[PDB]
Amino acid sequence: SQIRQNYSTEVEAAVNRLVNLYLRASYTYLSLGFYFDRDDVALEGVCHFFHELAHEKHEGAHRLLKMQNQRGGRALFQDLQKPSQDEWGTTLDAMKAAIVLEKSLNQALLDLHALGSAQADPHLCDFLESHFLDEEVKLIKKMGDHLTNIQRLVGSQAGLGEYLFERLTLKH
Amino acid sequence: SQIRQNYSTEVEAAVNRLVNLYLRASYTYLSLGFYFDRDDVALEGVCHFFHELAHEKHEGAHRLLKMQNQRGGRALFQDLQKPSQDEWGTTLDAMKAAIVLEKSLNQALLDLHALGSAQADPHLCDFLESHFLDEEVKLIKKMGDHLTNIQRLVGSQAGLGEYLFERLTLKH
Amino acid sequence: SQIRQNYSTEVEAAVNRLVNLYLRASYTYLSLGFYFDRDDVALEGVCHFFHELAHEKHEGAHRLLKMQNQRGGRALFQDLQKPSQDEWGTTLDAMKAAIVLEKSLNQALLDLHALGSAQADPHLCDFLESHFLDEEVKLIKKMGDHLTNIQRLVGSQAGLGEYLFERLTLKH
Amino acid sequence: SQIRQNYSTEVEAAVNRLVNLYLRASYTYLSLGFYFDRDDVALEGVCHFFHELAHEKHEGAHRLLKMQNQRGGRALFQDLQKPSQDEWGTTLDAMKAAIVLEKSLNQALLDLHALGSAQADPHLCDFLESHFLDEEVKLIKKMGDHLTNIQRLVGSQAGLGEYLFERLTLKH
Numbered sequence A, B, C, D: 001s002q003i004r005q006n007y008s009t010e011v012e013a014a015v016n017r018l019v020n021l022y023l024r025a026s027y028t029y030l031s032l033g034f035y036f037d038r039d040d041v042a043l044e045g046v047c048h049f050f051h052e053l054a055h056e057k058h059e060g061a062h063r064l065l066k067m068q069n070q071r072g073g074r075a076l077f078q079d080l081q082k083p084s085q086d087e088w089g090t091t092l093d094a095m096k097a098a099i100v101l102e103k104s105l106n107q108a109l110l111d112l113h114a115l116g117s118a119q120a121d122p123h124l125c126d127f128l129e130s131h132f133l134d135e136e137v138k139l140i141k142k143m144g145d146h147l148t149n150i151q152r153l154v155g156s157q158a159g160l161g162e163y164l165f166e167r168l169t170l171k172h
Ligand SMILES: [Cl-]
Pocket: A081, A082
């Protein structure tokens, strides 16, 4: 490569794996949103919430792939596994699955940051700091806030709570 | 002092104590608002309500200190005690603690007004009448209104009520 | 905590201590500004300079507390000590005290950055880099610039110099 | 009188005396301003400062006389003594004479407020609180601020200081 400088094969490979993780997360969110669009589920705000995240995770994959080319690494794509479930339960089940997914992405980001640090790759470290680490902290805080409000609304009137949360917290 | 006229040492000292009370109240409100911002509490309207009051109480301290200098008294600052609690319970617990705090500030204002009256200090009396006494009556009425609505919403579905009050009465 | 990830108890505790340091600094600046507002001091530009810093340090405390909740740590507030002096001397004395205060805040920021680095907490390190370290370097440079101009103006006409600096460098 | 209610002869007489005091103060300020307009004094900002106060004191007399008629009292005018000096010395001498004058007006206001209080005349007490007491406190604080800045500028270069104060603090 005519441009590659200070860009380890270890980082290059980890960036390709992280792209696979983001595209898998986008796919998971596509499935979550279409479940909430079912006529027998019908929670529009929940569908919109997950479809926005499907878009955000596609955009994160695109940013990683752009950076891979800016550094002179080579994008390599692998098969994308299907999401973990075909049906996603309640809004509470779905938001618990989303927080699990986001904490897995966050740990992958932190692992790649630590590899970059070990490789003395400050451009990689800055790139994750600037475009990924705070976006993930903010999203996980928002999901935790939502989980608390969903849990408070269960009581012994779960249907009522699930409707009110979708109507009065999520966007429709 | 070149400007001091009709300004007793008793009033000067009581104004400094009242400043300490207002800064303590601001601190209490800072803590109340950050509790409601926790991911395991997550009541944005409640956080906003208390943070606005933290600002209002800072502004009251600034107005007192400005008046102290306008009269030729000397601002003296003391240590600020931390708030009475680290965790504030439910919205109902927090609004009960806030009304207690506001009635303590109101009694301090009335005490200082009575001292000013005894000292034949009409500028001090006017100052409290114009900038503090009605603001306190209005705030205490608003808190009492909120307490009644929160209490009505407890029923036997406390979580539901707490969510609805934050969504439909407070600003988010 | 449902959101906490990669957030050490050491960092959590150091963030709470840093909040106390920022609120103490805000209080110091409140006292500095009210001293310059005295009818027997009467340097409006100096009062404005310190009151702006009191606001900036309150805002830094709020940003730290917001981040503490975003990471799933728990805000804990302690008593706030009163400022070190009741009267602040000349503009030169006050700007020397301010530079001492700012270098203490800067060292606390650098200490917390080093703890974050040792704890492999890149979100904390980025957070300080993005919102605190350069703001502190810029403020300390501005204070050093002011100190040089104040010192140049003392000569053997100190009152004249103190007036001219407040009129022609500070904002009124 | 068809309108007079709760308006003592004592207050009526004291309001007429206070009108005389305000018109005397206006006259004093007219003389102060014309002294500073002399070609051998030539401090335009000082002339403007005093002429604005001559206008303010005329307006206070007009407000008192309007209130006297609103209450059903009878305006009675007496001779107006000339000002205490024909020449007013330095800006410092003049601002010291002005503070003395303002403290005499302030004590007259406070005396009339106390008479109103003794006479259970709350409209009179409110009237002074609303239109006179804080205006006087604010003006005396401004004059004290000016006195400190003038004093700081004397040094051993009095002419220089007097010019700089008129140029950089007063309005021309
Ligand atoms: Cl699979």
